[PDB]
Amino acid sequence: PFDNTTYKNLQHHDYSTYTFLDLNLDLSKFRMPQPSSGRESPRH
Amino acid sequence: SNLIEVFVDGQSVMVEPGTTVLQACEKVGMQIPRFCYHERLSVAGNCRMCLVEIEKAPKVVAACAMPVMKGWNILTNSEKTKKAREGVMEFLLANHPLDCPICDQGGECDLQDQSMMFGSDRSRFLEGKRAVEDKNIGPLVKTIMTRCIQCTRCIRFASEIAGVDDLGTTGRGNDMQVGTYIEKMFMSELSGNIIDICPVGALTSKPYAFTARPWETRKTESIDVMDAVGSNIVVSTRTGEVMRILPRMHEDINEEWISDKTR
Amino acid sequence: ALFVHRDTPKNNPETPFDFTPENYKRIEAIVKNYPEGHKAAAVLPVLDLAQRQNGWLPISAMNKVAEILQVPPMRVYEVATFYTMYNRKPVGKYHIQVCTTTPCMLRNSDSILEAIQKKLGIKVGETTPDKLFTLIEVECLGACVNAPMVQINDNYYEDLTPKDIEEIIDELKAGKIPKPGPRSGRFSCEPAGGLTSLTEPPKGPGFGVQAGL
Amino acid sequence: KTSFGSLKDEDRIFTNLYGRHDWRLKGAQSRGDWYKTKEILLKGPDWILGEVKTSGLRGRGGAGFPTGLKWSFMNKPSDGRPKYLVVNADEGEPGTCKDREIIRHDPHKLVEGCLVGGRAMGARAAYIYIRGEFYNEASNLQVAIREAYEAGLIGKNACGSGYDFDVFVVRGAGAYICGEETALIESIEGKQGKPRLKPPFPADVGVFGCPTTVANVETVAVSPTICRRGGAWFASFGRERNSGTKLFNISGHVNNPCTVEEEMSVPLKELIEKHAGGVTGGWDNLLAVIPGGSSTPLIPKSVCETVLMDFDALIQAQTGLGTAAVIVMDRSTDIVKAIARLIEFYKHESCGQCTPCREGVDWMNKVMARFVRGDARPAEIDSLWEISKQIEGHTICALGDGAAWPVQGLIRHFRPELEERMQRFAQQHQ
Ligand SMILES: NC(=O)C1=CN([C@@H]2O[C@H](COP(=O)(O)OP(=O)(O)OC[C@H]3O[C@@H](n4cnc5c(N)ncnc54)[C@H](O)[C@@H]3O)[C@@H](O)[C@H]2O)C=CC1
Ligand SMILES: Cc1cc2nc3c(=O)[nH]c(=O)nc-3n(C[C@H](O)[C@H](O)[C@H](O)COP(=O)(O)O)c2cc1C
Ligand code: SF4
Ligand code: SF4
Ligand code: SF4
Ligand code: FES
Ligand code: FES
Ligand SMILES: [K+]
């Protein structure tokens, strides 16, 4: 059934304060190992 | 050698790759005006006083930051170079306070001198100026932040040479203030050298404050004895009384700094 | 409005601040997004996290971000005073942000600003005495075709009239939650008198794909 | 082709612009996205660079630098440092609200664009610097990226091509200057959003010191459609060196302010009178149009009649194309008050770094605040012009240029209105 009348983006009515950061915490496992500069910080 | 040939006002000079426009003009004896560039600090590129015309290029370049490319003819005295210098000096003197008589930097100010040299001789600014809250960063450096031209030699010195990382810019825009953001006492062992490299009277010497004035001081080039480094100093005196102690440049000792004990 | 700090009894380095353990796991997930040796790149997210746990930023959240990321505290003070979202003063529970730049001012955002002012009894920059509403005036919020619009803490409220914004303030006072969308007839950004484009069905996978691919 | 406009729905890149279809993965794959992505990855970097150079795609951020030439700056072997794509998603420009629509309604198209763009430049990951005020848009995009990782489309072994590519989203914190590419890099690096000087360009020293291409949401998201449909398809629309489709944001004093995708060289009058429902009060009620968001100078009604909405025909109309954000201003507009509110925006959104913008944008806002009331004299007009000419090209980034240009457009087209403002101030106050 083709519909061009209803706004399908109703999910952002259900976003809380920590939604972005919990999505980041969920995506923390799918990611490649970060590159390293060879030192702990530019002050090390 | 891998030296490339550039031109300053037509005159050729051979430079190492990585040489800036400012250093290339230095090699033929011309000093491009500057406020934030310091040869012992990192390149900031944020006072825009070194804007200079490269010919066959319709834009002024930051001479402190732009490296020379092979074949550039640097026009240090052309029309749009001088228009850029006068415009930038006009913006520096927009919000700068009329404090030159009550200022310890009068007569030894970069802003006065290269306003006489490279800026206009009058104001188009018809508004009211800003006034910045002063800070208390110790018993040595008198702070009058209304005079600050926001050149960030504070920050580059306290980060790179002093190793303190406690001066920085808060705010944004015209409300951007150089300070510690808290009531913090900037007392390093090299904390008085920010009195030197500040081109304006925003950071002055609190012991030296109000006592002398640079043209009447005799300069005696002498040696530090407060430690065994042997820092070269200038004892500046006035009528048989020692007024203050400045550093001399010596590339192998103290490059152009002295400690707070010396100062 | 200042960009220096003075130690009040409610804002000092002896003000208690600590993250929750779920916030520490969120911070570790943030730090793992950046290369090793560039942990300072997590200054802006984690400090924003310190605004989401607390509502604002005392000078103990800035020092805690400076402590857990191994950065100097002035480098966090700079970020916390540079960016306009970091509340360095305790704002209300609903932080109303009215956009009054030129595309919203052309469509009469001042009517909605005055409607919020006379509705809540405060002016621009102040907080209602029940600590529920802070009204400030912000720049372009990126909802220009839905002008005029406000923002309440996360949520854009668009195509507004003074009646609509009085309704939104009434249901913020009522303890409910409003719907973050355009309060006119349209849905997101379309022409209000019907769809002038994208009326045909979308062509699906494989449409117009060039050969050799 | 001579005439332009009236773009069909089969030729749209941003289908589901309006949020009317499903933005998620089953909705995006059913509209053409993530189709034959493995072959686009496996045909190499130079093929994708040749497709983007063929398409004539210019930088949708607003400057219009050639996207193929821009992305080919990364086409060089590594030196130990990783390489990065960074997608600019701040969009703080007044008038401009299209990248919000791409992130919010076609998010997987932006993810596939990150994959294709980062493959073309050999990049390791993507950093989508989204604006922090677009919080629901950011969580929208993160749900999409979670769908893309769980479907094996990005990450380890992206689309089964043996190429590894992460997609990171970093929120902003409320600074318009962080949309500028080096200031965005500095904001990603956990510092103040202050622009770096160029050189070094980000292709040499970008984010974290790495080779980095910062590119807009629209110039990144159209790249899978260019790689699927072809370069000749995208070069078939618009004039020469003005190729493609473009999202337009017609706001202000129109009957129906809207975002609409349209062919590139469409006339401004046709665009406003077709998609926006015309100016409120008719076309004779038109006073001025800011054609591409606040950074471009306004043009009056005598210029808006025959002007084409691409780059070169707006350069010839002594303005810029910019972000193609059309702000329409009718005859009832206090136009000096609008330009002064705009210069007030430019002083509140100015990072304070170099001297001409930090001092002169506040000094221009004080002059414009006196020009609204008329509390001045006409010799200060040309003075103000020269102040703009002391900011234009004398700054680190182009926010000084983007603040000098509206003042120049207002003076150049409405000097008599300024003068009669000030002389009626002089007669009713002196
Ligand atoms: N989309 C938005 O929200 C906004 C857009 N703008 C637009 O942005 C433009 C000004 O922005 P800028 O990026 O400062 O201007 P533009 O001169 O510098 O640069 C555009 C791109 O071209 C690249 N580029 C140009 N010459 C290059 C070279 N020789 N080598 C390597 N890369 C080179 C730069 O890296 C950059 O990514 C204006 O057209 C303005 O309308 C301005 C404000 C907001
Ligand atoms: C002050 C200033 C703000 C900018 N803001 C944005 C922005 O918010 N979004 C954007 O895509 N480009 C912005 N740009 C343009 C960028 O510098 C850059 O050209 C663009 O982000 C990526 O290049 P592209 O045009 O090839 O896509 C801004 C430029 C300036 C000078
Ligand atoms: S710092 Fe220089 S220009 Fe400023 S008041 Fe002192 S002497 Fe005058
Ligand atoms: S106080 Fe002096 S050295 Fe420090 S930023 Fe200001 S002008 Fe520069
Ligand atoms: S011109 Fe303005 S926006 Fe750009 S680096 Fe300078 S202060 Fe920042
Ligand atoms: S000296 Fe080059 S900009 Fe300050
Ligand atoms: S002008 Fe108010 S949202 Fe852009
Ligand atoms: K000094």
CA distances in angstroms from D96 to C32, C104, D275, listed in the order given: 33, 12, 16
CB-closest option in D366, D389, D393 to B127: D366
Terminal-residue alpha carbon distance, chain C: 58
Contact D289, D328 (CB under 8 A): yes
Contact D233, C208 (CB under 8 A): yes
Do C34 and C120 have their domain in common? no
- Judge if the upstream peptide bond of residue C202 is cis by omega within 30 degrees of 0: no
Contact D327, D335 (CB under 8 A): no
C208 found inside a domain? no
CA distance linking residue B125 with residue B120, whole number of Å: 12
Return all residues near C15 (Cβ < 8 A) that are at least 6 apart. C58, C59, C60
**Final residue of a domain: which of C50, C73, C90?**
C90
List the one residue out of B106, B105, B103, B60 whose CA is nearest residue B83.
Answer: B60
CA distance linking residue C147 with residue C141, whole number of Å: 10
Contact D259, D17 (CB under 8 A): yes
C81 found inside a domain? yes
* CB of B146 less than 8 A from some CB of C: no
List the one residue out of D39, D75, D51, D13 whose CA is nearest residue D227.
Answer: D51
CA distance linking residue B195 with residue B201, whole number of Å: 8
Give C209-212 contacts, CB < 8 A, sequence gap 24+: C209/D35, C209/D36, C209/D228, C209/D229, C210/D228, C210/D229, C210/D230, C210/D233
CA distance linking residue D361 with residue D402, whole number of Å: 10
All residues of chain C having their beta carbon less than 8 Å from the beta carbon of residue B157 are: none
Distance from residue D244's CA to the centre of ligand 5 (Å):
32
DSSP state of D192: -
Looking at ligand 2, which residue's alpha carbon is closest to its atom 19?
D61
DSSP state of C45: H
Query: Which atom of ligand 4 lies nearest, measured to the CA of B197?
Result: 3
The CATH code that applies to domain D25-235 is 3.40.50.11540
Do C52 and C140 have their domain in common? no
Distance from residue B37's CA to the centre of ligand 3 (Å):
19
All residues of chain C having their beta carbon less than 8 Å from the beta carbon of residue A11 are: none
All residues of chain B having their beta carbon less than 8 Å from the beta carbon of residue D199 are: 66-67
Q: What SS3 class is residue D126?
A: strand
Do C95 and C36 have their domain in common? no
Question: CA of B219 to nearest chain D CA: how many angstroms apart?
Answer: 34
CA distances in angstroms from C119 to C74, C108, C150, C162, C166, listed in the order given: 40, 17, 15, 10, 7
Identity (one letter) of the amino acid at C142? G
Query: Which atom of ligand 1 lies nearest, measured to the CA of D90?
Result: 3
Contact D23, D107 (CB under 8 A): yes
Contact B211, B230 (CB under 8 A): no
Identity (one letter) of the amino acid at D195? P
Contact B67, B18 (CB under 8 A): yes
SS (H, E, C) C111-152: HHHHHHHHHHCCCCCEECCCCCEEEEEECCCCCCCCCCEEEE
| Resolution of this deposited model, Å | 2.8
Largest CA-CA distance found in chain B, in angstroms, rounded? 57
Q: Rounded to an integer, what is the distance from CA B67 to the centroid of its chain?
A: 21
CA distance linking residue D383 with residue D389, whole number of Å: 10
Element (H, E) at C50: helix C43-54
Burial class, B251, CB count within 10 angstroms (exposed 0-12 / middle 13-18 / buried 19+): exposed
Q: Tell whether ligand 1 has an atom less than 6 A from the beta carbon of residue D275.
A: no
CA distance linking residue B258 with residue B229, whole number of Å: 10
Q: Tell whether ligand 6 has an atom less than 6 A from the beta carbon of residue B62.
A: yes
* CB of C210 less than 8 A from some CB of D: yes
CA distance linking residue D364 with residue D367, whole number of Å: 5
Contact D36, D47 (CB under 8 A): no
List the one residue out of B84, B100, B87 whose CA is nearest residue B146.
Answer: B100
Q: How many domains does chain C have?
A: 2
CA distance linking residue B257 with residue B189, whole number of Å: 11
Residues C84, D21: C-beta atoms closer than 8 Å: no
Q: Rounded to an integer, what is the distance from CA D190 to the centroid of its chain?
A: 24
Distance from residue B202's CA to the centre of ligand 4 (Å):
6
CB-closest option in C5, C72, C75 to B182: C5
Residues in chain C: 213
Distance from residue D406's CA to the centre of ligand 7 (Å):
17
DSSP symbols for B232-260: EEEEEESSSSEEEEEEPP-TTTSTT---T
CA distance linking residue C44 with residue D231, whole number of Å: 39
CA distance linking residue C20 with residue C24, whole number of Å: 6
Do C112 and C65 have their domain in common? no
Return all residues near D58 (Cβ < 8 A) that are at least 6 apart. D64, D65, D66, D67, D219, D241, D242, D243, D311
Please compute Rg for chain A using Cα positions: 20
Domain that holds residue C32: 17-90
List beta partners, residue C15.
Answer: none
Contact D396, D181 (CB under 8 A): no
Contact B232, B247 (CB under 8 A): yes
Burial class, D224, CB count within 10 angstroms (exposed 0-12 / middle 13-18 / buried 19+): buried
C186 found inside a domain? yes
Burial A2-14 (b: 16+ CB within 10 A, else e): eeeeebbbeebee
Structural determination approach:
cryo-EM
Do C112 and C144 have their domain in common? yes
Do C46 and C72 have their domain in common? yes
Q: What SS3 class is residue C105?
A: helix
Token reading at D256: 């129906």
Q: What are phi and psi of C203, to 5 degrees?
A: -80, -10
Largest CA-CA distance found in chain A, in angstroms, rounded? 62
3-state helix, strand, coil in chain D (%, to 5): 45, 15, 40
Per the listing, tokens 């629901």 go with D136
Q: Rounded to an integer, what is the distance from CA C170 to the centroid of its chain?
A: 20
Do C78 and C155 have their domain in common? no
DSSP symbols for D293-323: BTTSPPEEHHHHTT-BSSHHHHHTTTS--TT
Q: What SS3 class is residue D95?
A: coil
Element (H, E) at C157: strand C155-158
Q: What SS3 class is residue B218?
A: strand
Q: Tell whether ligand 6 has an atom less than 6 A from the beta carbon of residue B47.
A: yes
Touching A: D residues 90-119, CB under 8 Å: 104-105
DSSP state of D281: T
Contact B168, C73 (CB under 8 A): no
Contact B149, B200 (CB under 8 A): yes
C71 found inside a domain? yes
Contact C200, D10 (CB under 8 A): yes
Compute the half-sphere exposure of residue D185: CA atoms within 13 Å on the CB side of its CA: 24
CA distance linking residue D345 with residue C137, whole number of Å: 12
Contact D10, D225 (CB under 8 A): no
The full set of domain ranges for chain B reads 1-212, 213-263
Nearest listed ligand to the Cα of residue B37:
6
DSSP symbols for A2-32: --SSS----GGGG--TTHHHHHHHHHTTSSP
D-contacting chains (≥3 CB pairs under 8 Å): A, B, C
List beta partners, residue C98.
Answer: C137, C150
**Final residue of a domain: which of C90, C107, C135?**
C90
Burial class, C6, CB count within 10 angstroms (exposed 0-12 / middle 13-18 / buried 19+): exposed
Q: Tell whether ligand 6 has an atom less than 6 A from the beta carbon of residue B41.
A: no
Phi-psi domain of D16 (left: phi exceeds 0; alpha: psi -120 through 50; beta: other): left
Question: CA of D215 to nearest chain B CA: how many angstroms apart?
Answer: 24
Distance from residue B133's CA to the centre of ligand 3 (Å):
17
Per the listing, tokens 């090209």 go with D393
List the one residue out of D410, D365, D253 whose CA is nearest residue C105.
Answer: D253
Do C28 and C60 have their domain in common? yes
CA distance linking residue D309 with residue D314, whole number of Å: 7
What is the count of residue pairs from C and D with beta carbons less than 8 Å apart?
Answer: 236
Residues D136, C154: C-beta atoms closer than 8 Å: yes
Give C130-133 contacts, CB < 8 A, sequence gap 24+: C131/C92, C131/C93, C132/C92, C132/C93, C132/C94, C132/C172, C132/C173, C133/C92, C133/C93, C133/C94, C133/C96, C133/C169, C133/C172
Looking at ligand 5, which residue's alpha carbon is closest to its atom 8?
D351
CA distance linking residue D10 with residue C208, whole number of Å: 9
Compute the half-sphere exposure of residue B85: CA atoms within 13 Å on the CB side of its CA: 25
Do C98 and C26 have their domain in common? no
Identity (one letter) of the amino acid at B4? I
CA distance linking residue D327 with residue D276, whole number of Å: 11
Nearest CA in chain A to C200: A4
DSSP state of B14: E
Residues D139, A6: C-beta atoms closer than 8 Å: no
Residues A2, C49: C-beta atoms closer than 8 Å: no
Residues after which a C–N gap over 2.5 Å breaks chain B: none
Return all residues near D174 (Cβ < 8 A) that are at least 6 apart. C83, C84, C85, C86, D132, D133
CA distance linking residue C124 with residue D261, whole number of Å: 37
Contact B73, B7 (CB under 8 A): yes
Contact C182, C158 (CB under 8 A): yes
Token reading at C91: 């704002």
Do C115 and C178 have their domain in common? yes
C9 found inside a domain? no
Element (H, E) at D252: strand D245-252
Q: What SS3 class is residue B73?
A: strand
Q: What SS3 class is residue B131?
A: coil
Pairing type for strands D286-290 and D325-330 reads antiparallel
